[PDB]
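For reproducibility, we list the full input for the INN complex.
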Amino acid sequence: DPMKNTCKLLVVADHRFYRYMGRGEESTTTNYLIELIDRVDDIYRNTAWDNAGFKGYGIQIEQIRILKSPQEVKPGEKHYNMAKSYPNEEKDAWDVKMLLEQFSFDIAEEASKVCLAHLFTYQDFDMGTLGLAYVGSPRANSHGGVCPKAYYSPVGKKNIYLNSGLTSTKNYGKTILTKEADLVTTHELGHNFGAEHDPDGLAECAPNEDQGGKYVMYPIAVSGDHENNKMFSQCSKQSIYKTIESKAQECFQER
Ligand SMILES: CC(C)C[C@H](CC(=O)NO)C(=O)N[C@H](C(=O)N[C@@H](C)C(=O)NCCN)C(C)(C)C
Ligand SMILES: [Zn+2]
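The corresponding predicted structure, in tokenized form, follows.
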């Protein structure tokens, strides 16, 4: 359906994001995330995934959750919104893969109702990481990315969906730029949409500075200073195209 062209999102701002990006203000936090998703959406909507008319596909916020305080946790338990980081309390942040997995566990019920769930946090993941996301696929039985397609979890007694990704706006002990934060989320969502990383070489999927620079699925974060930086490469387009055409009827909605 040119009609079923929108991937509805559950956007979650944890207590950390609320505090450090939102000024402890619900209005400020909300507005930041509404505006960033809208800027990301401009990128997606204007992309012609088949280099022709397969365009107008993007993202909309369906629900926003602002977690104003950390989740109180009993000894031995864990929650993605807890005060301490996991597994190592001394670090500024969680292990990123474990936080993505934890997020997907704790928000499973709400994630089952949307196309994708995305966590916005403010924590300095080790070694320069900015975000993470499960990769989508056109495969019928695909577990990952767009469209909730359950994994049963013995421990929780319920269905969990890997239709999730996360973005941190802290890196290297600073708040990243607004243009950088848009590129993180674009990139993570891009995975959810079916894209892998752009490779270097003959493929034309990682151009030189003189030709517009790298595309948004480059594995090494693009600056956002170059022309291609906010766009999707051909490698990304082939992958996402295949995914959207197979999954849009299943879980995309009207804008
Ligand atoms: C938005 C970016 C593209 C996300 C990826 C991680 C990723 O691939 N997730 O989906 C990233 O963090 N790249 C990091 C990165 O590129 N970060 C930067 C800012 C970089 O630290 N370069 C600094 C090295 N002197 C890595 C893991 C490669 C260090
Ligand atoms: Zn990536």
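Residues 127-133, 171, 184, 187-188, 191, 219-221 surround INN (ligand 1) (CB under 6 Å). The two ends are 12 Å apart (CA to CA). Both points were considered when choosing residues for closer inspection.
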